[PDB]
Every structure is written in structure tokens, then in C-alpha cells.
Amino acid sequence: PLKTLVLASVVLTYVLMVFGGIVTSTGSGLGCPDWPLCHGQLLPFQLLQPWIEQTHRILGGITGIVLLATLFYAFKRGTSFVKKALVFIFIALILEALLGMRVVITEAPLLRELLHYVYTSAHLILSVFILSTITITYYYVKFFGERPKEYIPYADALYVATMFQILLGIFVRYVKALEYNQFVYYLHITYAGFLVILSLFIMFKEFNKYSLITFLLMTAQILAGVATVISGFFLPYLFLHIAIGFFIVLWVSYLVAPSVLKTYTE
Amino acid sequence: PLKTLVLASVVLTYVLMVFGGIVTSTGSGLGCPDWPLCHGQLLPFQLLQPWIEQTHRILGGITGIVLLATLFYAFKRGTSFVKKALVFIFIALILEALLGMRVVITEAPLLRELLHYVYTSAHLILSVFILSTITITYYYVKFFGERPKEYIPYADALYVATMFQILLGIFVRYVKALEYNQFVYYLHITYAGFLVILSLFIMFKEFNKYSLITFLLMTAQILAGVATVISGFFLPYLFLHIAIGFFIVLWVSYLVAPSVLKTYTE
Amino acid sequence: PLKTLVLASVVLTYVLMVFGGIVTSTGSGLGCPDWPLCHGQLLPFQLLQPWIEQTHRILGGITGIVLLATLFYAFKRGTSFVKKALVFIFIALILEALLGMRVVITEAPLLRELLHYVYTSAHLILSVFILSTITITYYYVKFFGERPKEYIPYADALYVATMFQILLGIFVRYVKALEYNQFVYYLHITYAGFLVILSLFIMFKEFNKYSLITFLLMTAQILAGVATVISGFFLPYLFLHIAIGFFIVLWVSYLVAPSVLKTYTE
Numbered sequence: 035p036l037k038t039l040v041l042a043s044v045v046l047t048y049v050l051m052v053f054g055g056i057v058t059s060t061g062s063g064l065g066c067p068d069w070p071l072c073h074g075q076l077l078p079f080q081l082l083q084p085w086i087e088q089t090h091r092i093l094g095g096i097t098g099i100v101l102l103a104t105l106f107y108a109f110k111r112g113t114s115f116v117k118k119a120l121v122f123i124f125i126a127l128i129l130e131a132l133l134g135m136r137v138v139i140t141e142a143p144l145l146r147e148l149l150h151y152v153y154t155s156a157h158l159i160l161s162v163f164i165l166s167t168i169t170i171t172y173y174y175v176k177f178f179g180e181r182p183k184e185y186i187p188y189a190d191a192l193y194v195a196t197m198f199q200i201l202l203g204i205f206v207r208y209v210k211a212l213e214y215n216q217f218v219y220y221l222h223i224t225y226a227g228f229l230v231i232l233s234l235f236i237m238f239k240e241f242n243k244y245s246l247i248t249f250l251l252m253t254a255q256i257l258a259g260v261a262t263v264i265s266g267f268f269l270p271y272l273f274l275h276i277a278i279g280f281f282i283v284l285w286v287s288y289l290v291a292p293s294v295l296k297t298y299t300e
Numbered sequence: 301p302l303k304t305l306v307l308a309s310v311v312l313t314y315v316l317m318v319f320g321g322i323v324t325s326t327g328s329g330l331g332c333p334d335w336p337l338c339h340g341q342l343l344p345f346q347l348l349q350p351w352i353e354q355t356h357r358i359l360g361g362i363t364g365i366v367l368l369a370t371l372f373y374a375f376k377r378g379t380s381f382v383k384k385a386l387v388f389i390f391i392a393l394i395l396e397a398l399l400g401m402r403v404v405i406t407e408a409p410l411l412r413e414l415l416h417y418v419y420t421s422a423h424l425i426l427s428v429f430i431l432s433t434i435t436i437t438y439y440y441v442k443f444f445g446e447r448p449k450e451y452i453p454y455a456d457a458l459y460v461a462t463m464f465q466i467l468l469g470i471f472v473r474y475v476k477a478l479e480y481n482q483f484v485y486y487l488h489i490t491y492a493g494f495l496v497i498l499s500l501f502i503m504f505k506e507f508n509k510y511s512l513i514t515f516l517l518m519t520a521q522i523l524a525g526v527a528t529v530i531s532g533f534f535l536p537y538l539f540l541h542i543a544i545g546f547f548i549v550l551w552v553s554y555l556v557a558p559s560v561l562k563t564y565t566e
Numbered sequence: 567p568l569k570t571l572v573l574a575s576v577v578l579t580y581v582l583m584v585f586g587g588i589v590t591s592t593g594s595g596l597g598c599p600d601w602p603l604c605h606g607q608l609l610p611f612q613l614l615q616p617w618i619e620q621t622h623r624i625l626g627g628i629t630g631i632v633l634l635a636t637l638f639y640a641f642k643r644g645t646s647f648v649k650k651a652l653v654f655i656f657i658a659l660i661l662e663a664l665l666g667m668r669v670v671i672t673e674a675p676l677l678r679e680l681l682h683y684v685y686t687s688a689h690l691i692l693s694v695f696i697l698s699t700i701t702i703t704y705y706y707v708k709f710f711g712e713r714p715k716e717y718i719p720y721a722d723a724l725y726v727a728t729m730f731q732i733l734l735g736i737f738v739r740y741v742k743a744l745e746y747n748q749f750v751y752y753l754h755i756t757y758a759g760f761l762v763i764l765s766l767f768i769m770f771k772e773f774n775k776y777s778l779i780t781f782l783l784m785t786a787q788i789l790a791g792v793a794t795v796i797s798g799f800f801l802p803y804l805f806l807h808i809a810i811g812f813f814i815v816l817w818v819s820y821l822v823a824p825s826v827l828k829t830y831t832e
């Protein structure tokens with residue numbers, strides 16, 4: 035029962051994060067006649083269906099329900115790892131809720147804008163942390179008595195590099211400091227090359243289906259990212275990029291889980 | 301016979317790549333009286349002997365001949381690794397040939413300039429991939445029955461970091477997006493420090509002749525890079541930098557080969 | 567007796583480096599009435615108590631004395647590792663002394679300014695190298711007959727990444743090339759995120775007091791760095807940042823020492 039709950043929570047979390055990145059994609063009012071076929075906002079240095087909103091609310095509610103059910107079942111017939119993982123997920127959720135409470139610290143326009151950037155980026159950072167933790171937990175509930183066979187030669191370094199790239203993408207999306215947004219965009223597009231090189235070396239070190247899928251995911255995300263940039267900010271291209279990025283988060287978490295858990299017991 | 305062919309192909313590939321980087325160095329017409337003693341083009345943000353051409357053509361022809369001979373001898377009395385390596389080298393060569401065919405995709409000036417940058421950078425990226433693959437193959441044909449003793453403590457991480465630095469250098473050389481060229485130049489000069497730190501730590505972890513040579517190669521390349529920049533773009537300084545960079549590519553490929561091949565059979 | 571000398575040299579070196587970064591912090595004349603409560607110089611792109619000086623001189627003299635005593639006792643009843651470490655510390659000290667001798671190479675204003683940046687940055691780089699080497703030596707003199715148990719899962723990668731971040735901070739502090747200073751400042755603040763991610767993954771891989779302390783040190787340094795930037799350059803915030811950064815240097819050196827020394831004898 036716990037395995038089904040954690041798998042459902044992984045799915046719901048991924049779908050909710052992708053959905054939020056699809057409504058929030060230059061959709062504060064989802065303007066233009068082409069709901070999903072109208073260019074989004076360009077990067078600063080380069081310068082309304084009630085259905086989507088109600089289904090976003092429903093998705094948030096249902097994923098909260100399952101996360102609560104998973105938390106309750108973690109302490110019932112669950113190991114210490116699952117309890118700790120859940121606790122870290124719900125601490126992140128509480129942090130997101132507190133970030134929602136935007137009690138005014140200072141009305142200073144500069145520090146106001148910065149704090150707005152901090153809140154917006156921290157929401158996505160906590161979402162990515164929740165997704166990674168729940169994916170590692172989902173791996174943990176499986177293979178519990180099994181011997182944790184590995185999947186790729188360098189999951190750890192790949193995990194860290196991928197998470198840094200995800201952080202760069204979040205900064206590009208939300209940190210609109212203009213000089214820093216341009217810098218972080220150019221660091222993002224360039225570090226994509228490091229990710230490609232690392233995936234190629236991983237595939238060379240041990241070629242299996244997982245290495246090939248990792249390289250193909252990198253290449254599909256890079257291609258998608260470029261496309262999004264090749265022509266304005268087409269919503270469909272911007273979406274596919276978001277979906278592939280969050281699935282890459284999930285994929286690297288799942289690939290890193292066996293390397294870390296191989297040193298555990300049972 | 302195969303070992304001699306792969307060694308000759310390694311030499312020819314390195315010499316051809318260096319030569320191309322010596323003619324292409326601000327030598328579209330090789331202007332100025334000092335054929336090799338006249339400053340080259342500065343970076344965008346900072347703003348004709350028939351012999352060389354005919355010997356470049358001869359070198360390209362002879363290296364193509366050997367690569368073809370090596371490909372033919374790979375399938376004759378060769379292992380699967382050598383066949384795959386050759387196939388990946390000739391796929392890269394076919395990709396370079398297709399990049400030579402610059403059928404007009406779009407006349408859009410922006411997307412035209414970008415695609416020009418993509419073609420120019422991809423040629424060098426494929427050249428570096430070919431050099432690395434042929435160096436790993438040359439290591440493979442040697443020590444075939446021998447036990448693959450290691451040379452440096454961290455060849456893999458060193459290989460990945462060095463390849464990322466080479467990619468940065470290629471982007472600086474060819475990607476003239478001005479804002480991005482300045483960014484990538486400053487990322488190149490700064491990541492050189494990371495390479496120096498990594499080489500120093502490698503030398504500390506296990507000091508032998510290979511670690512010392514790696515550190516000295518980094519230091520000679522950094523010094524050369526600075527010199528090239530200290531005074532305009534003197535061709536001799538620009539050349540030595542190119543030669544040392546491509547030899548660093550070869551060196552890190554040769555150093556990484558034993559770490560990856562230690563997990564193979566025979 | 568050697569262990570006491572190396573521990574004293576570690577302390578003196580850390581305190582002298584921190585002190586120098588506290589006087590040199592926009593204190594060429596230590597102007598403004600608030601000796602330690604007056605904003606320092608902003609970054610270029612963003613635009614006198616005799617006691618402190620005499621105690622800085624006294625601290626330099628006493629730390630030189632101990633370093634000399636440690637060097638003398640290294641060759642007396644000391645192993646080869648300690649002799650080599652001392653020799654590398656005193657070579658760095660001789661290099662610092664030579665950098666003090668600023669014989670005029672070229673009066674070219676550009677190359678003069680660059681060379682000034684090179685001297686100022688190289689002084690701090692040599693100081694950090696001395697601190698790291700003396701911390702590794704202090705670890706070596708302890709546990710000499712003991713089995714070198716590890717402290718954190720990834721000390722090496724953490725050491726290299728931390729040293730690169732320290733290099734970035736030194737460049738931000740001293741390299742005032744304006745376009746490059748802005749770039750390196752934005753690379754510093756962004757690579758702090760990579761350091762946080764790496765520390766989090768380290769803590770996940772093996773949670774103990776050392777992993778928690780490493781993560782807390784990163785987080786305290788990041789917080790301090792931001793504060794320094796949140797409001798001008800308050801001297802107290804600027805100081806705490808310097809002190810935490812140099813202690814992070816010492817901490818990562820101490821954490822990396824057991825991983826490298828585990829492959830040694832005795």
C-alpha cells in the first residue's frame with residue numbers, strides 16, 4: 035500500500051509541477067487568442083480559460099491529499115528512511131506555504147524586487163527538492179529486500195550536475211535582474227554542453243539502455259531549449275522544455291538512488 | 301599492422317587539426333606581410349602563400365587515406381571496440397562533410413549568422429571527438445593482452461573538465477555573438493583556474509610523471525592563452541595555444557582510456 | 567613538539583589571513599569615523615588606528631617565527647611528507663616576498679593595471695595554498711600511526727569545488743576589470759548554489775556531524791555573502807564573510823586530508 039502511495043505521489047508531484055510551469059508560462063492572465071500557441075515573454079535582456087485554473091486547483095488538492103496519505107502511511111509499517119523522506123517533503127511544503135505568506139519585510143523597491151525573485155525561485159527549488167526526494171523514496175520502497183544493482187557508472191556526479199543545471203534554468207526563468215538574467219541564461223546554455231559531455235562520457239564508460247536514455251533526454255532538452263529560443267517563446271516549445279526538464283530531475287533522482295542506497299542495510 | 305595504422309591516424313588527425321587552426325587563425329586570405337608574425341583578429345567585444353594551402357590539402361588527403369585504411373583493417377582481424385570506434389570516427393567525418401554542404405535552410409540574417417556559428421563550432425567539436433576517439437583506440441590496440449595499469453588518480457573527471465574547457469575555447473574562437481562571446485571568453489579564462497586546481501589536486505593525490513606532465517601542460521596552455529591576449533593576437537602565440545590545446549585533448553584521452561578499459565575483458 | 571608547532575602555525579596562518587582581509591577590507595587608510603561600522607567599497611560595476619597596523623605587523627612576525635620553527639623541526643625527527651609540505655609553504659612565502667618586490671616590468675597603463683591585479687590576487691592565492699597545505703600537514707602529524715578513518719563521502723570533489731569558489735571570491739575581491747569583475751561576481755553568487763547542492767548531496771549520502779557542519783558552513787557563508795551585498799559593504803558583514811570563507815578553506819583541507827592519506831603508508 036505504501037508503494038502505491040509513493041508512486042502516486044511521484045506522478046502527482048511531477049504533473050502538478052509541469053502544469054504550474056504551463057500556466058505560469060507567461061500566463062498570469064493567459065492572454066492572446068492562441069491559449070497555447072502565442073509567444074511568451076522574452077528574457078529581459080532581449081527586450082484565460084477558467085478550466086486550466088480550476089483543474090490546477092483540483093490537481094493541487096488531490097496531490098496534497100495523497101502526500102498526506104503517504105505521510106500517514108510512512109509512520110504506519112514504514113522504515114526510518116521513508117519517515118525522514120516524508121518529513122523533509124512536508125517541511126518543504128510548509129516552507130512553500132510560508133513563502134506564500136508575503137508579509138512585508140521592507141518596502142524598499144530594490145529589496146522588494148529581490149525578495150520577489152527569492153520567493154519565486156525558492157518555490158521552484160522546493161518543488162524540485164520534493165520531486166527528487168519522492169523519487170528516491172519511490173526507489174527505496176521498491177528493491178527493499180533486493181540487492182540494489184546500479185544503472186549508470188556516474189549517477190552521483192550526473193545528479194549534482196543536473197541539479198545545478200536545473201537551478202540555472204530556474205534562475206533564468208524567475209530571476210529577472212537583467213544583467214544577472216543575461217549572465218545566467220548564457221551560463222545555462224553553456225553548461226548544457228558540460229551536461230552533454232558528461233552524458234557522453236557516462237555512455238562511453240558503460241553503454242546500456244539507461245545511459246542511452248540519459249543522453250537522449252539531455253539532447254531532447256537542449257534541442258527543446260534552443261527551439262524555445264530560436265523563435266520568440268512559443269508556448270508549446272516552452273512547455274515541452276519544462277516537461278522534459280522536470281522529467282530529467284525525476285530521472286536523475288531515480289538513477290542516483292541505487293548508488294546512495296547501496297551502502298545502506300536491508 | 302592495425303596498431304601502426306591507428307598511431308598514424310592519431311598523428312595525422314592531430315597535425316591536420318593543428319594546421320587547420322593555424323591557417324584558419326585570422327587567415328581567410330592570410331593577409332599582412334608577416335605571414336606568421338602579424339596580429340590576428342581580436343575578440344568582437346574588444347573592438348597568402350599557396351604553399352600552406354596546398355600542403356593543407358595534401359595533409360587532409362593523406363589523413364583521409366589512412367583513416368580509410370584504418371577503417372578497412374578494423375573489420376579485418378580487429379575487435380568490436382575498434383570497429384565501433386572507427387564507425388564513430390567515420391560518422392563524425394560524414395557529419396563534417398554534410399556541414400560542408402550549407403544548403404540554405406533560412407535566409408533570416410539572425411538565424412543565418414547563428415547557423416554559421418553552429419556549423420563552424422560543430423566542425424571543431426567533431427574534430428575533437430575524432431581525435432579523442434582515435435587516441436582511445438590507439439590505447440586500446442596497445443596493452444590489449446596486458447593489464448591496464450592506471451596513470452593518474454582522477455582521469456575521468458579530468459577528461460570531462462578538460463573537454464568542457466576545450467568546448468569553451470571553441471566557442472570563444474568561433475561563436476562571435478559579441479555579448480555571448482565576451483561571456484564565454486570570461487568563462488574560459490576563469491574555468492582555466494578550475495582546471496589548474498584540479499590538476500594540482502590530482503598531482504597531490506598521486507605524484508608521478510603523468511600528473512606532473514598534466515599540470516605542466518595546463519600551465520603552459522594557460523600561460524600561452526594569456527600571452528595571446530596580453531598583446532593583440534600575435535600569430536605565433538595563437539598557434540602555440542592551439543597546438544597545446546589539441547595535444548591536451550589527446551593527452552587527457554590517453555590518460556582516461558585505462559580507467560574506462562579496466563572494466564572490459566581482454 | 568612538531569604537532570604543537572604545526573597546530574600553532576595553522577592557527578597563526580588563519581588569523582593572519584583573516585586579519586589582513588579585515589584591514590585590507592577598504593582600509594588602505596581605514597577612513598570614516600566607524601572604524602568597523604562604515605560601508606566599504608562597492609564592486610566596480612555597481613558604481614586609521616595605529617593599533618590595528620602594529621598588531622598586524624606583530625602577528626605577521628610571530629607567524630613567520632613559528633613557520634620557521636616548524637620548518638626547522640620538520641627536518642628534525644620529521645617524515646618526508648612534512649618536509650615536502652614545509653618546503654612548499656616556504657616556496658609560497660618566497661613567492662609572496664618576490665611579489666612584494668614590484669620591479670617595474672612595463673609602464674603600459676593597461677599591462678600595469680593587469681599586473682597589479684595579478685599581484686594582488688596571487689598574494690591571496692598563495693595564502694590560501696599555505697593554509698590548505700598546513701592544515702593537511704596538521705592532519706598528517708595526528709593519526710600518524712592510526713588508521714585514517716574518513717569523515718565525509720566526497721571530500722575530494724568538495725575540496726576542488728570549494729577551492730574554485732575561493733578562487734572566484736578572490737577574483738571578485740581583487741580583479742577590478744569591471745566587465746570581468748561583474749562576470750566573476752555573478753559566477754561566484756551562482757556557483758554558491760552548486761556548492762550548496764553538492765553539500766546537500768554529501769549530507770544525503772552519509773549524514774554525520776561533519777556533513778552537517780559542512781552544509782551549515784556553506785549556508786552561513788552564502789547568507790553572510792548576501793548580507794554583505796544586501797546593504798552596501800558594511801565592514802562587520804564583510805569581515806564575517808572573510809572569516810567564514812577562510813575557515814571553509816581550512817575545513818575542506820582537513821576533510822580532504824584523510825581521503826588522500828588513506829593510500830599512504832604509516
Ligand SMILES: CCCCCCCC/C=C\CCCCCCCC(=O)O[C@@H](COC(=O)CCCCCCCCCCCCCCC)COP(=O)([O-])OCC[N+](C)(C)C
Pocket residue numbers: 129144148151152155156159160201209210211212213214215755756758759762763788792795796
Ligand atoms: C537548495 C539548493 C539551491 C540553493 C541555491 C542558493 C543560491 C544562492 C544565490 C545567491 C543569492 C543571493 C544573490 C545576491 C543577492 C544580492 C544581489 C544583488 O547584488 O543584485 C545583483 C543581481 O543578483 C541577483 O539578481 C541574484 C538573485 C538570485 C536569487 C536566488 C534565490 C535563491 C532562493 C534560495 C531558496 C533556498 C531553498 C528555500 C529556502 C529554504 C546585481 O544585479 P542587479 O540587482 O540587477 O543590479 C542593478 C539593479 N538595478 C538595475 C535596480 C539598479
Ligand SMILES: CCCCCCCC/C=C\CCCCCCCC(=O)O[C@@H](COC(=O)CCCCCCCCCCCCCCC)COP(=O)([O-])OCC[N+](C)(C)C
Pocket residue numbers: 231234235237238239240241380381384385388425428429432433436437463464466467470564
Ligand atoms: C569539445 C569536444 C566535445 C566532445 C568531446 C568528446 C565527448 C565524448 C567523450 C566520450 C566518448 C568517447 C568515446 C571514444 C571511444 C568510443 C568507442 C565506442 O564507440 O565503442 C564502445 C561502445 O560503447 C560505448 O562507448 C558507445 C557509446 C560512445 C559514444 C558514441 C557516440 C554517441 C552516440 C551513441 C548512440 C548512437 C550510435 C550510432 C552508431 C551506431 C565499445 O564497447 P563494446 O566493446 O562494444 O561493449 C562492451 C563494453 N561494455 C561492456 C561496457 C558495454
Ligand SMILES: CCCCCCCC/C=C\CCCCCCCC(=O)O[C@@H](COC(=O)CCCCCCCCCCCCCCC)COP(=O)([O-])OCC[N+](C)(C)C
Pocket residue numbers: 247277278281
Ligand atoms: C517528456 C517526458 C519524456 C519521458 C521519457 C521516458 C523514458 C522512459 C524510458 C524507460 C524507463 C524505464 C525503464 C525500466 C526498465 C527496468 C528494467 C529492470 O529494472 O527490471 C525491473 C523492472 O522495472 C520495470 O517494471 C519498471 C517499469 C517502469 C516504467 C516507467 C515508464 C515511465 C514513463 C515516463 C513518462 C513520462 C511522462 C511523459 C508525459 C508527460 C525489475 O523487475 P524484476 O527483475 O522482474 O523484479 C521482480 C523481482 N521479483 C520477482 C522478486 C518480484
Ligand SMILES: CCCCCCCC/C=C\CCCCCCCC(=O)O[C@@H](COC(=O)CCCCCCCCCCCCCCC)COP(=O)([O-])OCC[N+](C)(C)C
Pocket residue numbers: 223224226227230231256260263264395410417418421422425426467475476477478479480
Ligand atoms: C558534443 C559535446 C558538445 C555539445 C555542445 C552543445 C552546446 C549547446 C549550446 C546551446 C546551443 C544553442 C544556443 C542558444 C540558441 C539561441 C541563441 C540566441 O539566444 O542568441 C544568444 C547567443 O547565444 C548564441 O551565441 C550561442 C551559440 C552557440 C552555438 C553552439 C553550436 C553547437 C554545435 C553543436 C555540435 C554538436 C556535434 C555536431 C552535431 C552532431 C543571444 O545573443 P545574441 O544572438 O548575440 O543576441 C543579440 C543578437 N543581435 C545583436 C543580432 C540582435
Ligand SMILES: CCCCCCCC/C=C\CCCCCCCC(=O)O[C@@H](COC(=O)CCCCCCCCCCCCCCC)COP(=O)([O-])OCC[N+](C)(C)C
Pocket residue numbers: 497500501503504505506507646647650651653654657691694695698699702703729730732733736830
Ligand atoms: C584559491 C586557492 C587555489 C589553490 C588552492 C590549493 C590548490 C592545490 C591543492 C592540492 C595541493 C595541496 C597539497 C598540500 C600537501 C602537500 C604535501 C606534498 O608536497 O607532499 C607530498 C608530495 O606529493 C605531492 O603531493 C606533491 C605535489 C603537490 C603540489 C605541490 C605544488 C605543485 C608543484 C609540484 C612540482 C614542483 C615542486 C617544487 C618543489 C620541490 C608527499 O608525498 P611523498 O610522501 O613524498 O610520496 C609518497 C606519496 N605517493 C606515494 C603518493 C607519491
Ligand SMILES: CCCCCCCC/C=C\CCCCCCCC(=O)O[C@@H](COC(=O)CCCCCCCCCCCCCCC)COP(=O)([O-])OCC[N+](C)(C)C
Pocket residue numbers: 513543544547
Ligand atoms: C605542444 C605539444 C606539447 C607536447 C608535450 C609532450 C609531453 C610528452 C611527455 C611524455 C609522454 C609519454 C611518456 C610515456 C612513458 C611510458 C612509460 C610506460 O607506460 O612504459 C610503456 C612504454 O611506453 C612508451 O614506449 C611510449 C612512448 C611514447 C612516446 C610519446 C612521445 C610524445 C611526443 C609528443 C609530441 C607532441 C607534438 C609536439 C609538436 C607539435 C610500456 O612499455 P613496456 O612495459 O616495456 O611494454 C613491453 C611489454 N612487453 C615486453 C610484453 C612487450
Ligand SMILES: CCCCCCCC/C=C\CCCCCCCC(=O)O[C@@H](COC(=O)CCCCCCCCCCCCCCC)COP(=O)([O-])OCC[N+](C)(C)C
Pocket residue numbers: 489490492493496497522526529530661676680683684687688691692733741742743744745746747
Ligand atoms: C593555483 C590555483 C589558481 C590558479 C588560477 C589561475 C587563473 C588564471 C586566469 C587567467 C589569467 C589571465 C587572464 C587573461 C589576461 C588578459 C586579460 C584581459 O583580456 O583583460 C580582460 C579581463 O580579464 C582580466 O580582468 C582577468 C584578470 C585575472 C587575474 C588572475 C591572476 C592570477 C594569479 C595566479 C597566481 C598563481 C599562483 C602564484 C604564482 C605561482 C578583459 O577585460 P578588460 O581588461 O577590463 O578590458 C577593457 C580594459 N579597459 C577598460 C582598460 C580598456
Ligand SMILES: CCCCCCCC/C=C\CCCCCCCC(=O)O[C@@H](COC(=O)CCCCCCCCCCCCCCC)COP(=O)([O-])OCC[N+](C)(C)C
Pocket residue numbers: 114115118119121122125159162163166167170171197198200201204298763766767769770771772773
Ligand atoms: C534546483 C534544485 C536544487 C535542489 C535539488 C536537491 C538538492 C538536494 C539533493 C540531495 C538530498 C536529497 C535527499 C532525498 C532523500 C532524503 C531522505 C533522508 O531525509 O533520509 C535519510 C537521512 O539522512 C540524510 O539523507 C538526511 C539529510 C538529507 C538532506 C535533508 C535536508 C537538509 C537539512 C538536514 C538537516 C535538517 C533536518 C531538519 C528535519 C529533521 C535516511 O537516513 P537514515 O536511514 O535515517 O540513516 C541511515 C543512513 N546512514 C547510515 C547513511 C546515516
Ligand SMILES: CCCCCCCC/C=C\CCCCCCCC(=O)O[C@@H](COC(=O)CCCCCCCCCCCCCCC)COP(=O)([O-])OCC[N+](C)(C)C
Pocket residue numbers: 779809810813
Ligand atoms: C567563522 C568560524 C566558524 C567556525 C565553525 C567551527 C565548527 C567546528 C565544529 C567542530 C569541528 C571539530 C570536531 C572534532 C570531532 C573529532 C571527533 C573524532 O575525530 O575524535 C578525535 C578527537 O578529535 C578532537 O580531539 C579534535 C578537537 C578539535 C576541536 C576544533 C575546534 C575548532 C574551533 C574552530 C574555531 C574557528 C575560529 C572562529 C573564530 C575566528 C579522535 O580522538 P580519539 O579517538 O580519542 O584519539 C585518541 C587515540 N589514542 C587514545 C590512541 C591516543
Ligand code: HEM
Pocket residue numbers: 055059158196199200202203204206207222223226227229252255256257258259260261262263272275276279280282
Ligand atoms: C542547450 C540549450 C538550452 C537553451 C537555449 C535553453 C533555454 C531556456 C530558456 C530560455 C529558459 C527560460 C524559460 C522561461 O523563461 O520560461 C530555460 C529554462 C529552463 N531550462 Fe533550459 N535551455 C537549454 C538547455 C537546458 C538543459 C540541458 C536543461 C536540463 C538538463 C535545461 C533545463 C531548464 C529548466 C529546468 C528550466 C526552467 C523551467 C521552469 O522553470 O519551469 N535547459 N531554458
Ligand code: HEM
Pocket residue numbers: 321325424462465466468469470472473488489492493495518521522523524525526527528529538541542545546548
Ligand atoms: C588561462 C587563460 C587563458 C586565456 C587568456 C585563453 C585565451 C584564449 C583565446 C583568446 C582564445 C581564442 C582563440 C582565437 O580567437 O583564435 C582561446 C581559445 C582556445 N583555448 Fe584558451 N585561454 C586560456 C586558457 C585555456 C586553457 C587552460 C585551455 C585548455 C586546457 C584552453 C584551450 C583553448 C582552446 C582549445 C581554444 C580553441 C583553439 C582553436 O579553436 O583552435 N585555453 N583561448
Ligand code: HEM
Pocket residue numbers: 587591690728731732734735736738739754755758759761784787788789790791792793794795804807808811812814
Ligand atoms: C551566495 C551568495 C554570495 C554572495 C552574495 C557573495 C558575495 C561576495 C562579495 C561581494 C565578495 C567581495 C568581497 C570584497 O569585495 O571585499 C565576496 C568575496 C568572497 N567570497 Fe563570496 N559571496 C557568496 C557566496 C560565497 C561562498 C558560498 C563562498 C565560499 C564557500 C564565498 C567565498 C568568498 C571568498 C573567499 C571571498 C574573498 C574574501 C577575501 O578575499 O578576503 N562566497 N563574496
